Ligand binder design. Structure first.
Ligand code: AJP
Ligand code: LMG
Ligand code: LMG
Ligand code: LMG
Ligand code: LMG
Ligand code: LMG
Ligand code: LHG
Ligand code: LHG
Ligand code: LHG
Ligand code: LHG
Ligand code: LHG
Ligand code: D12
Ligand code: D12
Lengths: 49, 60, 49, 104, 431, 116, 166, 122, 101, 48, 91, 60
């Protein structure tokens, strides 16, 4: 609320992930989802042994 | 400067707020509880916990 | 193998919101016009989705 | 006896400028040596393995690549095979638009 | 900065995907036009005096309990809570304000002692001037360092942030200015220029110390030049007051006392260096032991002063690494993403070669083992030639795996791991 | 007797080189052993810049509050940038200044002595 | 006199810097023993690699360089004096580095198997490094840097290189 | 006291482990206070802000402990200059101020008075 | 007899050190050879270098390299008479059966 | 060679420096082995 | 003073300044941001735009001017001559 | 040969123990039960190799 009108930040908090975005922050995320790891054989086998 | 955990803190006075005083008392109690686990007495007085601990050690 | 460490790191070459969109990745592009006999000079590798 | 202050300031500026310029030139040369070591190493290995013709071809190929860049960028006309090579690499967002499935 | 402009250019290039895509980031036309725009805008801002509209201060507003961390707020016994807010400093006033003003004056007079302790570079320069160039040069140097210290202390105590904050923001310029000043002084002293002092020479002597008092200089004997005869940590901290006139009176009295004490000490030193002898050190040495001569004594003293000022000049180089002195003014943050960015998805080499020596783990690959390089021998890591088998980490940063701390840094493990350095070899230089 | 070059081009003595050599060696030795330099140590600076900034801000805010106006806080590095994307970009200058706290103050060399 | 005594220009400064880079290549092996302390000089480990490759491409390159510089440059009296002085200073620094290597090769085993050797190694780098830096500070500037026990011999050798066989 | 070579080498190893540590300490309000290298700790010790009873944390520990209960923290701080300066600060600055504040305000009960200033020198 | 070889090698190393000192002192022409240390050194080192002075003339008649040549030749000769296994790390025969040894 | 590396006459400077460093602490902080074991036992018994 | 022109550094600085001046002369837009760039890329008046958007519009206008200049002045002249056999790398 | 004529099977290679909270364990040294955690990755395991660090992480 710096200015008298409130300003909402769009980019700063990420609320989604795609292939390139995952590749950019691969080792900086706190969790991994199955929706992207299902396309790798070893990762999928680890998810569903 | 009363928040300084040293001799400098004693030189200055607290802002006279009962809730702040209670908070400081609780913090001091926690600090003393931590302190008692690493510093002991060479000759404990009878009637204290450390005295009975020493008695049990000698009996063992 | 050297162990990977998952520590978030601060911005570089871009503001924290985005990633490198215009990075060049070696993958062939297909023309809509049919090419009867023309090697792509780079196999598309795993073909099925 | 004592020179004016501005004279000393000018002398200091001149000396500092000369020193910094020479240091910058030396560092640029060192950076050039650092960046292009592997190319000379590969040329030397090609020479040593017993194929001097390959090394000469590599050198004249670098020269012809410079000539090709001069033709393509400084001048206007294109070169044969440019369209075929233009479809060999693509940007990441283009890959996401075309090849990447929507389930990921 | 450079990095900010690069980020802005990258953002602009990303914005243009929708309207007119670019072939890649490093098109000559786009880079050229953005460089021209940046240079033009920078020079326009520098020339138009539009930098006076920059913002450095913000207001601080305390949020109410509704907008605060309500989960932290807890009611104890139904009568108190943890939302602490006390009315800054409230102290009962003394019986007479004149008494506390006099007390502050005396305290300032006492505190002025620590400013003139001969433990810094300016004191060394003043001492050398007193010894070599007479009394006037030393008096001028002392007056200059006194004026500089008084200006800095008054700016800090009276809260003149408009000068303090921007000046402290220029991190490396203040180091470079000090280096230049010390280099010029060292050369001038080395050439041994001697002549009758004029007004211009005296003003140069004054200005040298005045400018040197505004930089960070090497100090010997700390924890003693920072003492103060009061319940504070230094001499720059103020005192609590109740209103604006009392604030002004108390702080003016403190500054006046400091200035009076410093001036009295300067006058005492000026008289003392004349009382016994202009150069009494020669007589003291003669009393202590045998004296060689006067010319040799002057040569030894000049060499000692030159060595001391050289030490004061170059003492600060090992303290800071190149990441804080070179990459920081460019615009990079520590452990930046630019350092570790790879050249391409297929090439593991780093993009920026000029900064490839920063933040290297002991398990990183060695670049001198490439085919056909024939680089230096590196006998100390013959058994571990595939890695950079040495630890040079700084601060908290440091990682270890399958290359333990003991092997790298401790005892016989490190010594035994480099046993190839002490192996005799057969060599014939001529035959 | 020997030529020793023209007199127009300046010459550096040997005393300056000796002083530089001894000064470098003594600086390294003094940095290695903090407690042996006549019972004292060698300090690069006198006061930390953050300490000076905090004291100056405290005094300025006190003076402004006593004068009847809302106090302001002066930031090291610069003010905010009017942007609508992310919070880090808006306050990039102050964050950049604060992120160099450890390198700015602490020494790069080890503080204590090993092997001796 | 007919000898040139004008100031040195930038190409001579670059050549002299490249020449000065030789003892650094000779003593670059012992940089780690010093860098382990005071990590701020860690960059000094990674700066000489191309020079190490180029100066060691042939086993007899240093002798060829010495003979091409002493006869082709130092002997000539039409080259400015400062350039010859700096070339001879670099050659003498290389000689000093060779002397240090030779005296390293004959260390006793008792000193070899003690931490003293490490200290020695560090010094073998550090001193040399200082010299080079000092010379470089007076190489980009067209000035004369004087070093004890070396400069006088260099001054004599410059004029002995002249009137050689004449 | 006669130390064995075992103790000498153990002390050397511990000094090796802690030669790059950065310390933290806690105040009366239970808030961590500042990134503290060795010289900052020495300055705080000299100024009378911290003492041997302050809670400190370093790299080699798991919890916050009193400063005198950490293995090698007091020998590092207590150089002879630090001892002389802290003695001066205790004797000539803090003690008279404590006496003055005790005399000025009755809220400091005479029967129950702390003796932290007396032992600051140690 | 190990003592014989030990004494011979020690004497050879001392003579090599003397020759190296002569090579170093050849750089300074201001030294006087009538002083006791320099006189003793030149008295010890005179004949071996005197032989090479006759054997090898100066390359151009202006520069002298005779002490350096003598030092190099003696260094090679003493290298010829080094112990077969100098221990250190040599007598351990490196690690296992090796291509080098 | 590892045993010879830590021989007393090869560690004199380390001994001097460690003595100088360790003499800085108060004399009452030195403890016997039995006292240290007793303190450990007291700590864990007090925990119980 | 010709003495200043004698030094290499002064010549290099003058050449750099002249190149910068020519670039600014040929790429700096004027009145084409609101007319073409701003409305096309944001559909808003330049004044209402955020400070980081006005720079983008100005960059777009400058890039359009640069491409127009490089097509209508240099490439027409250098392409009036047809492809002169287009030499290619033989190896 | 010990180093080259022997390999470790997939199901027989050494791995650190799993102790969970490490409460119920047989104490090899009764006085110090922490000595039994030396073969695991427990937070209170003696001498892990890399000191535990005060991490302050902000994720994307
Ligand atoms: C293209 C570049 C530039 C040109 C150049 O380099 C290549 O060519 C090189 C080559 O030409 C060199 C010349 C080669 C010819 C040499 C001739 C030489 O005359 C010498 O005259 C002396 C007379 O006493 C010598 O005799 C000495 O004493 C003993 C008698 C000899 O035996 C011993 O050998 C020597 C001997 O009779 C002879 O050696 C002179 O002393 C130096 C000399 C002129 C050299 C000077 C430097 C050069 C010209 C070099 C010159 C820079
Ligand atoms: C104020 C400035 C002070 C600091 C100065 C340093 C900072 C500035 C650094 C920038 C200076 C750039 C120097 C020139 C570097 C370019 C080197 C070069 O030619 O490109 C480096 C190029 C690329 O080099 C090699 O090229 C190969 C080609 O197949 C492969 O791509 C290899 O991967 C690549 O390494 O080297 C060449 O091959 C050219 C050599 C031809 C002879
Ligand atoms: C001051 C004004 C500043 C002008 C800024 C213009 C400089 C352009 C640098 C943008 C770099 C963006 C980026 O991601 O680069 C990423 C690119 C790598 O990425 C690819 O690299 C390829 C290599 O030839 C080509 O250059 C491709 O165009 C490029 O996409 O990195 C670089 O080109 C190095 C940039 C170093 C910039 C230092 C300044
Ligand atoms: C590649 C090889 C290059 C050869 C270099 C030849 C020297 C040419 C560089 C000249 C610039 C002088 C560098 C010194 C300088 O300005 O920074 C040294 C000065 C420190 O200077 C001191 O600083 C103090 C404040 O801490 C005070 O201001 C003192 O007055 C001031 O003397 O640092 C700075 O001013 C910050 C900028 C640092 C720039 C990078 C310096 C690192 C360059 C490597 C030089 C290594 C020199 C080794 C010397 C060993 C000493 C133990
Ligand atoms: C977005 C822009 C960000 C870019 C940031 C640029 C940082 C560059 C700043 C200039 C630094 C100068 C170093 C350039 C020297 C080239 C040598 C080289 O590339 O070596 C590159 C080597 C790294 O070498 C690489 O190392 C790797 C390690 O895995 C591998 O071994 C590789 O094989 C090897 O090539 O780095 C150095 O040797 C750095 C030397 C630095 C010497 C100190 C300079 C002293 C003078 C400083 C005075 C200031 C200079 C001007 C600074 C301001 C410039 C604007
Ligand atoms: C610090 C170490 C002590 C300083 C040592 C400096 C290096 C000493 C060089 C040892 C002598 C080298 C040599 O063989 O010189 C052998 C001779 C020494 O040549 C002598 O040099 C002197 C220098 O003033 C004078 O010029 C004498 O007239 C000349 O005979 O060198 C040559 O013939 C030409 C120089 C080759 C280099
Ligand atoms: C690391 C260093 C290794 C070597 C150190 C040796 C000590 C040498 C002392 C010699 C003394 C010395 O070096 O010479 C100082 C010299 C003295 O001035 P003059 O040469 O005019 O004086 C003699 C005259 O009589 C010549 O006719 O001043 C110069 O000419 C300036 C050139 C050096 C300028 C150095 C500046 C480099 C830093 C520039 C920073 C630029 C940014 C500035 C921002 C404000
Ligand atoms: C080489 C690097 C550049 C060095 C150049 C020197 C920069 C020096 C800047 C300050 C010098 C003084 C300018 C007056 C500075 C000035 O007048 O202040 C102007 C200042 C501006 O007030 P604002 O509230 O607009 O400013 C906000 C800032 O003050 C931030 O707190 O007003 C006050 O601070 C009033 C202070 C109470 C009134 C104080 C009166 C007592 C005056 C005592 C006179 C002492 C003389 C001491 C001399 C050593
Ligand atoms: C960049 C390399 C071009 C250097 C030669 C061009 C400059 C040029 O030829 O000017 C001629 C050059 C210096 O001549 P002056 O001092 O008369 O020239 C001063 C002016 O010509 C400056 O333009 O004389 C040389 O032959 C020295 C170069 C030795 C070779 C230097 C090699 C550099 C290291 C190897 C790379
Ligand atoms: C040229 C620069 C040096 C000039 C002064 C010469 C110093 C020569 C002696 C220093 C060795 C000090 C450590 C000795 C070892 C030793 O015996 O310690 C004795 C003493 C420590 O005293 P304690 O705390 O044991 O006793 C203080 C008693 O008063 C409390 O009962 O240390 C010093 O005096 C520190 C000296 C600091 C310097 C004092 C003068 C400050 C001058 C500032 C200007
Ligand atoms: C009985 C009498 C014996 C006493 C012998 C006294 C000899 C003292 C010489 C200095 C010992 C210092 C003690 C000292 O500094 O370290 C000495 C030490 C070598 O180890 P030592 O074997 O001496 O000590 C290990 C102990 O465990 C056994 O003594 O150095 C290293 O560990 C590596 C240091 C590399 C450091 C590189 C930078 C060096 C910068 C300083 C250069 C100093 C020389 C400057 C010359 C101007
Ligand atoms: C704009 C009013 C005149 C200038 C007032 C003094 C500003 C000094 C700033 C110094 C920063 C280094
Ligand atoms: C008593 C063992 C030898 C002591 C001196 C060895 C290190 C000397 C360093 C000289 C470097 C040129």
């Amino acid at each position: 609320n710096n200015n008298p009108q409130e300003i909402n930040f769009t980019n700063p908090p990420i609320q989604g992930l795609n292939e390139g975005s995952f590749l950019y922050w691969q080792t900086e995320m706190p969790f991994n989802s199955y929706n992207i790891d299902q396309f790798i054989t070893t990762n999928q086998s680890f998810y569903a042994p | 400067k009363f928040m300084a955990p040293g001799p400098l803190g004693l030189c200055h006075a607290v802002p006279d707020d009962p809730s702040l005083r209670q908070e400081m008392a609780k913090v001091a109690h926690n600090y003393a509880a931590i302190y008692r686990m690493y510093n002991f007495d060479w000759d404990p007085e009878p009637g204290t916990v450390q005295y009975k601990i020493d008695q049990r050690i000698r009996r063992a | 193998k050297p162990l990977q460490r998952y520590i978030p790191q601060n911005g570089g070459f871009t503001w924290p919101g985005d990633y490198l969109r215009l990075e060049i990745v070696e993958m062939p592009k297909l023309k809509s016009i049919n090419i009867k006999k023309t090697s792509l000079k780079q196999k598309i590798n795993v073909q099925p989705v | 006896g004592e020179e004016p202050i501005q004279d000393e300031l000018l002398k200091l500026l001149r000396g500092g400028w000369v020193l910094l310029s020479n240091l910058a030139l030396f560092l640029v040369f060192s950076s050039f040596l650092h960046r292009s070591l592997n190319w000379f190493v590969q040329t030397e290995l090609l020479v040593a393995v017993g194929a001097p013709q390959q090394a000469g071809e590599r050198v004249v190929g670098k020269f012809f690549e410079a000539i090709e860049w001069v033709e393509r960028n400084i001048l206007g006309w294109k070169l044969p095979g440019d369209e075929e090579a233009e479809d060999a690499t693509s940007k990441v967002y283009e890959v996401l638009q075309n090849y990447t499935p929507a389930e990921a | 900065s450079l990095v900010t402009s690069v980020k802005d250019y990258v953002e602009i290039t990303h914005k243009l995907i929708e309207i007119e895509p670019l072939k890649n980031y490093t098109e000559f036309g786009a880079v050229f036009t953005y460089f021209i725009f940046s240079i033009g805008e920078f020079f326009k801002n520098f020339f138009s005096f539009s930098f006076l509209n920059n913002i450095w201060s913000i207001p601080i507003i305390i949020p109410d309990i509704a907008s605060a961390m309500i989960s932290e707020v807890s009611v104890l016994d139904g009568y108190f809570h943890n939302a602490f807010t006390f009315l800054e400093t409230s102290v009962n006033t003394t019986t007479n304000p004149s008494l506390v003003i006099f007390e502050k004056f005396v305290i300032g007079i006492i505190n002025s002692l620590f400013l003139i302790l001969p433990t810094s570079t300016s004191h060394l320069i003043t001492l050398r001037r007193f010894v070599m160039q007479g009394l006037e040069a030393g008096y001028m140097a002392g007056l200059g360092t006194l004026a500089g210290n008084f200006l800095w202390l008054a700016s800090i105590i009276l809260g003149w942030r408009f000068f303090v904050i921007p000046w402290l923001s220029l991190d490396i310029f203040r180091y470079l200015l000090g280096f230049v000043l010390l280099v010029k002084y060292i050369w001038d002293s080395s050439k041994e220029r001697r002549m009758a002092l004029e007004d211009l020479s005296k003003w140069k002597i004054f200005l040298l110390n005045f400018l040197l008092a505004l930089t960070e200089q090497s100090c010997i004997y700390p924890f003693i030049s920072n003492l103060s005869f009061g319940p504070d940590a230094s001499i720059l901290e103020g005192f609590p007051v109740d209103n604006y006139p009392q604030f002004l009176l108390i702080h003016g009295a403190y500054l006046l006392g400091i200035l009076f004490g410093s001036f009295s000490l300067l006058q005492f030193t000026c008289w003392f260096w004349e009382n016994p002898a202009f150069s009494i050190y020669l007589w003291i040495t003669t009393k202590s032991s045998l004296k060689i001569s006067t010319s040799s004594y002057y040569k030894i003293l000049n060499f000692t002063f030159l060595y001391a000022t050289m030490l004061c000049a170059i003492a600060s180089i090992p303290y800071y690494g190149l990441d804080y002195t070179i990459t920081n003014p460019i615009g990079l943050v520590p452990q930046d993403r630019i350092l570790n960015q790879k050249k391409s998805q297929s090439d593991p080499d780093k993009l920026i070669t000029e900064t490839a020596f920063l933040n290297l783990n002991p398990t990183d690959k060695n670049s001198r083992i490439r085919d056909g390089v024939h680089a230096r021998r590196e006998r100390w890591k013959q058994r571990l030639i595939k890695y950079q088998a040495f630890d040079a980490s700084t601060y908290d940063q440091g990682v270890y795996d399958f290359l333990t701390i003991e092997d790298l840094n401790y005892g016989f493990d490190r010594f035994w791991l480099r046993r190839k350095m002490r192996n005799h070899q057969i060599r014939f230089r001529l035959f | 007797n020997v030529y020793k070059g023209p007199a127009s081009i300046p010459h550096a003595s040997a005393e300056v080189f000796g002083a530089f050599f001894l000064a470098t060696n003594t600086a390294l030795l003094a940095h290695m052993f903090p407690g042996k330099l006549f019972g004292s140590e060698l300090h690069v600076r006198k006061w930390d810049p953050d300490y000076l900034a905090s004291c100056c801000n405290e005094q300025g805010m006190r003076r402004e509050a006593l004068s009847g106006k809302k106090p302001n806080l002066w930031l090291l590095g610069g003010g905010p940038r009017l942007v609508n994307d992310s919070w880090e970009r808006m306050w990039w200058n102050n964050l950049h200044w604060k992120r160099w706290k450890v390198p700015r103050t602490g020494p790069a060399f080890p503080q204590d002595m090993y092997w001796q | 006199f007919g000898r040139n005594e004008g100031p040195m220009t930038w190409p001579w400064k670059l050549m002299c810097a490249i020449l000065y880079m030789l003892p650094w290549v000779d003593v670059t092996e012992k940089t780690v023993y010093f860098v382990e302390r005071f990590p701020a000089f860690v960059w000094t480990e990674y700066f000489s690699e191309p020079f190490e490759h180029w100066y060691n491409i042939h086993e007899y390159a240093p002798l060829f360089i010495f003979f091409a510089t002493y006869l082709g440059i130092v002997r000539n009296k039409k080259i400015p004096h400062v350039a010859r002085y700096h070339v001879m200073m670099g050659v003498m620094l290389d000689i000093v580095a060779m002397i240090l290597i030779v005296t390293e090769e004959n260390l006793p085993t008792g000193v070899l198997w003690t931490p003293w050797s490490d200290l020695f190694y560090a010094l073998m780098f550090w001193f040399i490094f200082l010299l080079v830096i000092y010379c470089l500070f007076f190489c980009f500037l067209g000035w004369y840097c004087e070093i004890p026990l070396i400069s006088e011999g260099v001054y004599l050798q410059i004029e002995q290189a002249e009137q050689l066989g004449q | 006291i006669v130390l064995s070579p075992y103790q000498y080498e153990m002390i050397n190893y511990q000094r090796m482990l802690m030669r790059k540590n950065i310390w933290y300490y806690r105040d009366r309000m239970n808030v961590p206070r500042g990134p503290c290298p060795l010289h900052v700790v020495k300055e705080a010790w000299v100024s009378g802000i911290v003492d041997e009873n302050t809670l400190f944390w370093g790299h080699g520990l798991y919890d916050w402990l009193p400063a005198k209960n950490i293995k090698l923290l007091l020998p590092m701080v207590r150089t002879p200059e630090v001892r002389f300066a802290t003695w001066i600060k205790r004797t000539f600055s803090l003690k008279p101020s404590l006496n003055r504040i005790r005399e000025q305000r009755k809220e400091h009960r005479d029967p129950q008075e702390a003796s932290l200033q007396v032992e600051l020198m140690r | 007899a190990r003592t014989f070889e030990r004494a011979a090698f020690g004497f050879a190393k001392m003579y090599l050190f003397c020759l190296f000192m002569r090579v170093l002192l050849s750089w300074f022409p201001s030294i006087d050879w009538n002083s006791q240390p320099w006189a003793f050194l030149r008295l010890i080192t005179e004949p071996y270098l005197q032989i090479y002075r006759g054997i090898l003339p100066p390359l151009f008649g202006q520069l002298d390299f005779t002490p350096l040549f003598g030092f190099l030749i003696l260094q090679d000769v003493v290298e010829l008479m080094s112990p077969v296994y100098t221990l250190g790390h040599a007598k351990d025969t490196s690690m296992f059966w090796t291509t080098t040894d | 060679l590892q045993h010879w590396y830590y021989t007393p006459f090869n560690r004199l400077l380390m001994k001097f420096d460690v003595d100088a460093f360790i003499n800085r602490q108060p004399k009452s902080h030195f403890l016997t082995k039995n006292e240290e074991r007793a303190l450990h036992i007291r700590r864990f018994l007090l925990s119980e | 003073l010709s003495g200043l022109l004698g030094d290499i550094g002064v010549k290099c600085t003058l050449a750099f300044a002249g190149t910068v001046a020519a670039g600014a002369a040929i790429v700096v837009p004027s009145g084409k941001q609101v007319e073409a760039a701003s409305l096309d890329i944001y559909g808003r008046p330049p004044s209402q735009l955020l400070p980081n958007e006005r720079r983008a519009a100005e960059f777009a206008a400058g890039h359009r001017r640069w491409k127009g200049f490089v097509d209508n002045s240099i490439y027409s002249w250098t392409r009036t001559l047809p492809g002169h056999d287009n030499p290619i790398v033989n190896p | 040969d010990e180093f080259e004529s022997d390999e470790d099977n997939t199901e027989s290679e050494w791995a650190p123990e799993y102790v969970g909270a490490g409460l119920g364990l047989v104490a090899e040294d009764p006085l110090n039960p922490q000595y039994s955690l030396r073969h695991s990755n427990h937070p209170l395991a003696p001498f892990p190799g890399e000191p535990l660090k005060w991490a302050s992480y902000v994720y994307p």
